[PDB]
Symmetry: none
Subunit: 212 residues, 2 copies
């Protein structure tokens, strides 16, 4: 009904050429994803092979959710975990303005235009993490159960805090479709970079693109 502060705890523990910088910030946080998920109620009690499968599945959406929320503070830019700011002016000149602008309007803006609080960002991340449809899962039913628990606990949280908005929870969940979509597109750009010879051979991101 409410392991919520454990989830916020997880989020606070992990965290502080334009493409090259974004990818290096990504490498940095991809690693912390291990410590982040381990601090998530019940995640550690799942078979090792399942924990790895869940992270290989949502790692990109998970990282995009995090830096997007961190960026609510600025405008027309994003704040990397390496302490750098990247302006959309730079995204465009480098060739990625389209997906960049999609991140700014469908994620950064929607979270700033409703004041998303870290505890909700942490919960959406946990819902993204507990995707029972991931291929290869030992017990997809237990994972599904865990997702449901984040749903319950999260809705329960929106009530205790924002009762004068008998909908908020539904508004939070509206970010999921965009994240899923933006996330798939980023994997494409990543493949693309390797396709055209400007592959970032110095990160671990490209290993995450391999087929399971």
């Amino acid at each position: 009904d409410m392991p919520v502060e454990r989830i916020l705890e997880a989020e606070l523990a992990v965290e502080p050429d334009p493409v090259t910088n974004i990818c290096q910030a990504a490498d940095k946080q991809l690693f912390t994803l291990v410590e982040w998920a381990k601090r998530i109620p019940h995640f550690s009690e799942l078979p090792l092979d399942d924990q790895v499968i869940l992270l290989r599945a949502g790692w990109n959406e998970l990282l995009i959710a995090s830096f997007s929320h961190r960026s609510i503070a600025v405008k027309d830019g994003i704040l990397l975990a390496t302490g750098l700011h990247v302006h959309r002016n730079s995204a465009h000149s480098a060739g990625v303005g389209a997906i960049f602008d999609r991140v700014l309007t469908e994620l950064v803006s929607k979270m700033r235009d409703m004041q998303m609080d870290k505890t909700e960002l942490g919960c959406l991340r946990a819902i993204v993490l507990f995707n029972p449809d991931s291929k290869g899962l030992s017990n997809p039913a237990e994972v599904e159960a865990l997702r449901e628990k984040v749903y319950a606990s999260l809705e329960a949280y929106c009530k205790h805090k924002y009762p004068e908005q008998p909908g908020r929870f539904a508004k939070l969940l509206l970010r999921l479709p965009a994240l899923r979509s933006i996330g798939l597109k980023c994997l494409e750009h990543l493949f693309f970079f390797k396709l055209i010879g400007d592959t970032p051979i110095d990160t671990f991101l490209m290993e995450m693109l391999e087929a399971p």
Copy 2:
């Protein structure tokens, strides 16, 4: 097995539909646009994703140009003496000749556009020819070319199986479809030459990923 279960043509048609939207500058900008979508296109072709990432990239670096030419050629069946770019523009041969690329342009119109228009190639067929062009087991660098060859064979089977079921009174449609491959291969090599040439004479298209594909692996 069943030819079509090992390589379903509805999945292949699906791939194609997901990606369907100075003359030279315009053609090159349409090319950049679709070069990118090639990533999403190939990811939807049955089994392409199950290959080692390095192989997927090698297959695309090898046939990207033939793959794009096949697509805009088919799209152009709709007009006469011109081609329809993915950016929504139409380019007439007259402008192509004024620019000095009327020779290859006419080759595309007669050896590809016309042949497809006349035999009424359908999107599923165009998609299968593209998949055959993609699974090229002779691409240098391949880690397991035997698996790629196997996949090509599956598209062949599945595609022949499709012509026989859909056009039962055209026994030689499959062989006729495959006749487009040699022209595509040939037209495709010539376009790489023109692309190099543009850079050679100082008319290199500014900021396009097109030029990046010309680098040697």
